Design a protein around this ligand. Structure first.
Ligand code: HEM
Ligand code: HEM
Ligand code: HEM
Ligand code: HEM
Lengths: 145, 141, 141, 145
């Protein structure tokens, strides 16, 4: 995936990410910014306004799971495919989520990192994270290939 | 296509950008070039390294076009007429590339306006940049 | 935006479809369902087998909507107002799926109208379907 | 990818059809329908009008080569990755072609097959060809991942 040195840059930075908040913000922004994604979360209760989405405990709780999943991929950058296996079958063969949405969530996460980390989230660092999220998206979509 | 609420959000956010528009356009181009290196190929005789005056100069021009668009939301096609012919007919920019620049712009705005860049505002700005992108890609024919 | 030439192409092509509109609408759905199985999850309440009454009846409705659009090429957003609310707000249709049905419609029209489906006409129809798709994905709340 | 049934169907169809003008039509239609794709073909001459594009001898000649590549793909359906690995690097790294365009061309090809081949190009057979062109497009995009 990334060069040894790119991995090092990403690893060091990822340490600072708050394991809770960021996932919930990313998932919540996906649902607000791209409302069709709400179709997949009918059991999550009230998603009818931006405020409702963002403050939904189920969105917050689920966002944590996705971020923990990203954190997990960050430890296996040279084998994202195997790492996102049971997730790829879930998302593809069971849920039928179009893979375009994997790219969109990846990009929302990047926007969220930017909002939270500001000037520390440099163009070079962000470029590294673009490789990572594209890796994760591609790994998740493998069951369609 | 922008609703009244979207137009409000876009105008308020761009107000917060204020005199930093040129700076943010330059940063967004930089992030685009670094994250998506094939975009560099549209600028073959630019030096695109960090701090390049050509990146700074072009950033200012892109930001100016965006400011013009914010001032003309009821008529993007007309306001961006010259630019759509340039990008779609003269330069034949692949439509993917507008998504890449739009993302880079959202990243940059989120970085610099974290207290202003709410989910609702993010959604409005996303729609604005998509609509600018639609106009800029409308003259391939 | 559709050019006057595009509108001419769209109207003439739809005239060629003539009495087969509902039949082609049904075939386009079938081709969408078989080629892109993900789209089937929007119709869990349908019998999706070949020749099912529900697919036939739905093909006719989709076709009638396209007919309405063809008769209203100067104002698609107005013409397709109710349908946009339905697809975007109620049904939460993923925008990618409009590209899938649109392609399926082009395949159907190409198959049945091979002398009429010139490159210029293909290009106009593609723009028409994209614009219908844009309108049907333009509305949130 | 394809079932043995789907491979047998695709192979029997491709065996019988007369396709020596199909590739030129498909490449011509790409450049007409998606005119940014013309950027990549400046050396081909007059692409100023739909008619100029379609009758451009260079477009017709290149299109045949492109279909020849597709037919080669058809003979190695078990190994589209290895088959297009070299072409993937050429297109992605040297020619700078965005991978979305591989999908657009595959779909134009399908439209062309439907135009040329009438009732035998059934919804079932077309869906098999969708699997083929999706496979070719994925194999060509590989050097992106
Ligand atoms: C791209 C990166 C993504 C990651 C890392 C990710 C991660 C996860 C994880 C870790 C789970 C829990 C699975 C389990 O416990 O077995 C999950 C479930 C789920 N994901 Fe994703 N996901 C991603 C993309 C998406 C997208 C883009 C959507 C929707 C548009 C989505 C929709 C869902 C749904 C509906 C569930 C089940 C929720 C429930 O009902 O419990 N995912 N995902
Ligand atoms: C938000 C969307 C965009 C806006 C508002 C925008 C705006 C502008 C403006 C104002 C100019 C200068 C026009 C002139 O010289 O008179 C320009 C030129 C140019 N743009 Fe864009 N642009 C956008 C997207 C893109 C994208 C995505 C690309 C390619 C990846 C691109 C590539 C170019 C190139 C190659 C030039 C000519 C630069 C030169 O050689 O002088 N643009 N653009
Ligand atoms: C050219 C684009 C489209 C047109 C013109 C169109 C048109 C229509 C029409 C006329 C109806 C009946 C609405 C009513 O009862 O008033 C309908 C319903 C519906 N459409 Fe679409 N549609 C399009 C795209 C799509 C796509 C891409 C999908 C999903 C893959 C989709 C999914 C549905 C669903 C699930 C319904 C409800 C059907 C039912 O319960 O009977 N539509 N559409
Ligand atoms: C079905 C997917 C595609 C296949 C199988 C394919 C195959 C090929 C082959 C075999 C060649 C070399 C032909 C020769 O020997 O001269 C080639 C060249 C080329 N392709 Fe593709 N290609 C595909 C898609 C595309 C797309 C979508 C684009 C751009 C929009 C593109 C742009 C080019 C260019 C610029 C060349 C070099 C032409 C020259 O020599 O000037 N290709 N392709």
């Amino acid at each position: 995936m990334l060069t040894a040195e790119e991995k090092a840059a990403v690893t060091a930075f990822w340490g600072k990410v708050k394991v809770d908040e960021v996932g919930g913000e990313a998932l919540g922004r996906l649902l607000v910014v791209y409302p069709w994604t709400q179709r997949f979360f009918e059991s999550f209760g009230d998603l009818s306004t931006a405020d409702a989405v963002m403050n939904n405990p189920k969105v917050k709780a689920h966002g944590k799971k996705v971020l923990d999943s990203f954190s997990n991929g960050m430890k296996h950058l040279d084998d994202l495919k195997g790492t996102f296996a049971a997730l790829s079958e879930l998302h593809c063969d069971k849920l039928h989520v179009d893979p375009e949405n994997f790219k969109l969530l990846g990009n929302v996460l990047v926007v969220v990192l930017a909002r939270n980390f500001g000037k520390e989230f440099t163009p070079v660092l962000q470029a590294d994270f673009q490789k990572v999220v594209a890796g994760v998206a591609n790994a998740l979509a493998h069951r369609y290939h | 296509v922008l609703s009244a609420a979207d137009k409000g959000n876009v105008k308020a956010a761009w107000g917060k950008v204020g005199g930093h528009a040129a700076e943010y356009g330059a940063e967004a181009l930089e992030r685009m070039f670094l994250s998506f290196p094939t975009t560099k190929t549209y600028f073959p005789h630019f030096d695109l390294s960090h701090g390049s005056a050509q990146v700074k100069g072009h950033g200012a021009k892109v930001a100016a076009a965006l400011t013009k668009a914010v001032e003309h939301l009821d008529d993007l096609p007309g306001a961006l007429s010259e630019l759509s012919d340039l990008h779609a007919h003269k330069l034949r920019v692949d439509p993917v590339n507008f998504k890449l620049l739009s993302h880079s712009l959202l990243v940059t705005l989120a970085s610099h306006l974290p207290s202003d860049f709410t989910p609702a505002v993010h959604a409005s700005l996303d729609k604005f940049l998509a609509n600018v992108s639609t106009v800029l890609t409308s003259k391939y024919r």
